[PDB]
Amino acid sequence: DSVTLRLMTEHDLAMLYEWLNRSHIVEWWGARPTLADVQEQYLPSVLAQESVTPYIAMLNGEPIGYAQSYVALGSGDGWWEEETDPGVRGIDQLLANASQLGKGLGTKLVRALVELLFNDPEVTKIQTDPSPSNLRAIRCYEKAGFERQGTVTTPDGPAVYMVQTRQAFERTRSDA
Numbered sequence: 299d300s301v302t303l304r305l306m307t308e309h310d311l312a313m314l315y316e317w318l319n320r321s322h323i324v325e326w327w328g329a330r331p332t333l334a335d336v337q338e339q340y341l342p343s344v345l346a347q348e349s350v351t352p353y354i355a356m357l358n359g360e361p362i363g364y365a366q367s368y369v370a371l372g373s374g375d376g377w378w379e380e381e382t383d384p385g386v387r388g389i390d391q392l393l394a395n396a397s398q399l400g401k402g403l404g405t406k407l408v409r410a411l412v413e414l415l416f417n418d419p420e421v422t423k424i425q426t427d428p429s430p431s432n433l434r435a436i437r438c439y440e441k442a443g444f445e446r447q448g449t450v451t452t453p454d455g456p457a458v459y460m461v462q463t464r465q466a467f468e469r470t471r472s473d474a
């Protein structure tokens with residue numbers, strides 16, 4: 299059914315810790331953080347100082363994944379140094395359950411996150427940066443309305459820079 303987003307809290311950290319150690323996640327995210335790693339890195343107030351907002355994806359009253367949005371400009375640590383536009387938001391996300399992968403749930407999560415961010419009238423464009431090897435994530439982002447721009451170097455290595463502008467989001471709301 300319907301994928302929604304709520305803010306992540308401190309109460310979600312043990313669950314997030316478990317998720318980040320599942321093999322389908324460890325593969326693409328990180329790696330293998332301890333409980334204390336997750337607690338000190340993903341505490342919502344700690345993420346705040348990075349301009350990162352954490353969310354839990356919800357489906358039929360159950361938590362099914364983690365997402366984050368961030369302000370690209372001024373990200374620090376070598377991140378997004380050529381950005382000039384404070385309206386740009388980036389996203390990252392994962393699905394908690396291996397049994398639920400490749401069933402279009404990720405596309406729904408991404409669509410829900412993109413709609414959320416464009417409801418901040420200050421947001422001009424959403425970016426994402428899946429690794430070149432992560433073809434499944436790239437295809438998920440494409441189905442969700444993102445377009446591949448090219449390869450950029452990040453502190454996590456080269457990435458496929460993908461974007462969806464507000465104008466593209468407006469134009470793809472109706473077929474009128």
Ligand SMILES: CC(=O)SCCNC(=O)CCNC(=O)[C@H](O)C(C)(C)COP(=O)(O)OP(=O)(O)OC[C@H]1O[C@@H](n2cnc3c(N)ncnc32)[C@H](O)[C@@H]1OP(=O)(O)O
Pocket residue numbers: 322323326327389390391392393394398399400401402403404405406426427428429432433434435437438441
């Ligand atoms: C910037 C970043 O966040 S980097 C990426 C982040 N996270 C991860 O990779 C964590 C582990 N993976 C996940 O949590 C999830 O797979 C997500 C969120 C990346 C994507 O969600 P999913 O539900 O699996 O994707 P969804 O099914 O909606 O779409 C994936 C597409 O790739 C295709 N696909 C499925 N498996 C693969 C694969 N192994 N290789 C290539 N393509 C694949 C699917 O068929 C679908 O395309 P199609 O509908 O045209 O046939």
Ligand SMILES: N[C@@H]1[C@@H](O)[C@@H](O[C@@H]2[C@@H](O)[C@H](O[C@H]3O[C@H](CO)[C@@H](O)[C@H](O)[C@H]3N)[C@@H](N)C[C@H]2N)O[C@H](CO)[C@H]1O
Pocket residue numbers: 326327328339348350368373374375377388389390391427428
């Ligand atoms: N100052 C930064 C802050 O801007 C922010 O950077 C963002 C990262 O989090 C994202 O990576 C995450 O998602 C990836 C999956 O998409 C995982 O492969 C990765 O393991 C995970 N970390 C990047 N894709 C985009 C960055 N802008 O968070 C950092 C540490 O948490 C801070 O140092």
Ligand SMILES: [Ca+2]
Pocket residue numbers: 419420
């Ligand atoms: Ca505002």
Ligand SMILES: [Ca+2]
Pocket residue numbers: 468469470471472473474
């Ligand atoms: Ca239209």
